[PDB]
């Protein structure tokens, strides 16, 4: 089957976003148990930006790697032009929902940095910021997981509509 190309890309996009959420959580918790200077805060900022760049770069790589396997399948005669254009469009929809999740986690970490600066002070608000971020980051990740499963479900139905066309 050629929808394994889309399924693989769907799992990889969800893993990269899940790993990004986990990296941002541990960076916040490391900065919360720590006593921060201006230099430590800037090292944390560089590590947050690297996590975002890594996630975006790895999502981009997986989508382009998925498109190479699809083009491979067209030249191998294992898919026709209409099936390949449905596979490429499903990979484009995965790219967009995965990009939105990365943008939302970067915007989410920004709000977390504002709490580590302003409200921080007292172990109790420390722990509520930690669980606030943990909750909102997982919400972003599961919304991507569900949108990615929906994009494959959309591809499998457009595959059954192309077979239902016959040769008309």
């Amino acid at each position: 089957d050629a929808k394994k190309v889309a399924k693989k890309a769907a799992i990889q996009a969800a893993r990269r976003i899940t790993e990004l959420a986990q990296v941002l959580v541990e960076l916040l918790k490391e900065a919360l148990k720590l006593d921060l200077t201006q230099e430590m805060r800037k090292k944390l900022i560089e590590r947050y930006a690297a996590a975002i760049i890594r996630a975006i770069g790895d999502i981009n790589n997986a989508i382009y790697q998925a498109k190479q396997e699809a083009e491979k399948l067209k030249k191998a005669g294992l898919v026709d032009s209409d099936q390949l254009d449905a596979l490429l469009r499903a990979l484009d929809e995965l790219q967009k929902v995965a990009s939105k999740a990365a943008n939302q986690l970067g915007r989410l970490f920004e709000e977390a940095l504002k709490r580590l600066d302003k409200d921080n002070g007292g172990e109790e608000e420390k722990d509520r910021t930690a669980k606030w971020f943990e909750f909102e980051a997982r919400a972003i990740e599961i919304a991507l997981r569900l949108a990615a499963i929906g994009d494959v479900f959309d591809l499998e139905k457009e595959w059954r509509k192309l077979k239902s066309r016959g040769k008309l």
Partner: protein, 150 residues
Amino acid sequence: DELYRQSLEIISRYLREQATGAKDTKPMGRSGATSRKALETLRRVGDGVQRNHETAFQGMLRKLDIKNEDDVKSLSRVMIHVFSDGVTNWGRIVTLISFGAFVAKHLKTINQESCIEPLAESITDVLVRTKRDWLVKQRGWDGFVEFFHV
């Protein structure tokens, strides 16, 4: 070094187009064809990355606070953190170059075009010094073009 020269020329020119807005008319070095097709690849893929992640890129830029030429080493430190898991692929490389272009546009608007070439050199230095043999095994910029061809 030919690999450093070609990489810096592609990255220098891409960062300079994004900040100023003009293309450089001056002829390339010895590469020529490969460097041109890498810039067309950078204009297609890199501009898309900047637009589809403008929210994330703008937030990173404000918190990194890139002001003068001593802040420019901060993106080279970000590159090292990006690669600290041992994974190297073209998607990460194109994304770092696109954030370099995103930073270059900001440097022009804060009257620090002075910093763009030092930014391009340090991005190229980390890329070539720390991943030379990977780049050679991926057939350099010819493989970068081949990877992002549709």
